[PDB]
Amino acid sequence: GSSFSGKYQLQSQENFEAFMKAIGLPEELIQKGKDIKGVSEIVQNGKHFKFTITAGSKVIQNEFTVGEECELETMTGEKVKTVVQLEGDNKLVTTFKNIKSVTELNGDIITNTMTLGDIVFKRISKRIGT
Numbered sequence: 001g002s003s004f005s006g007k008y009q010l011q012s013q014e015n016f017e018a019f020m021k022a023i024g025l026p027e028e029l030i031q032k033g034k035d036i037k038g039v040s041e042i043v044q045n046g047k048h049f050k051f052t053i054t055a056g057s058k059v060i061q062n063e064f065t066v067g068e069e070c071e072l073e074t075m076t077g078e079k080v081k082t083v084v085q086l087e088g089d090n091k092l093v094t095t096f097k098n099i100k101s102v103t104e105l106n107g108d109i110i111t112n113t114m115t116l117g118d119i120v121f122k123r124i125s126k127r128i129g130t
């Protein structure tokens with residue numbers, strides 16, 4: 001299975017600044033990063049996932065197997081041990097650092113929602129070729 005596989009780019013986001021402040025992203029990276037339409041690349045092979053998030057020179061590479069312990073490198077660079085689960089046929093769900101993350105794919109649109117307390121940080125991305 002390779003349902004999530006693809007190359008995607010941010011179209012729009014909500015609450016970037018409030019969320020990144022709350023998690024402790026350096027102010028310099030908040031200000032430089034707020035208008036970056038980052039590129040996300042996902043390679044899925046059954047339960048095994050590799051994903052790359054690129055925003056300028058900043059490249060975050062992660063991998064996990066659904067249902068197994070993984071170590072996810074977050075935006076600050078903090079690495080957190082967690083588990084990513086499938087929810088329904090189109091969602092990837094996990095929690096780290098008290099952040100609830102939901103990644104939902106519908107056709108060529110991926111929506112990622114991260115909520116920390118009352119702060120909801122929503123990203124909409126669109127497939128950009130192969």
Ligand SMILES: CCCCCCCCCCCCCCCC(=O)O
Binds near residue numbers: 053
């Ligand atoms: C060359 C100047 C450096 C640019 C630094 C960019 C700062 C990163 C911006 C954060 C983008 C948010 C990515 C989160 C991805 C996700 O939620 O899955």
Ligand SMILES: CCCCCCCCCCCCCCCC(=O)O
Binds near residue numbers: 051060
């Ligand atoms: C960098 C923070 C760790 C991310 C934790 C979520 C792991 C499951 C989702 C992986 C697919 C990545 C899709 C991201 C799309 C986007 O950039 O908004």
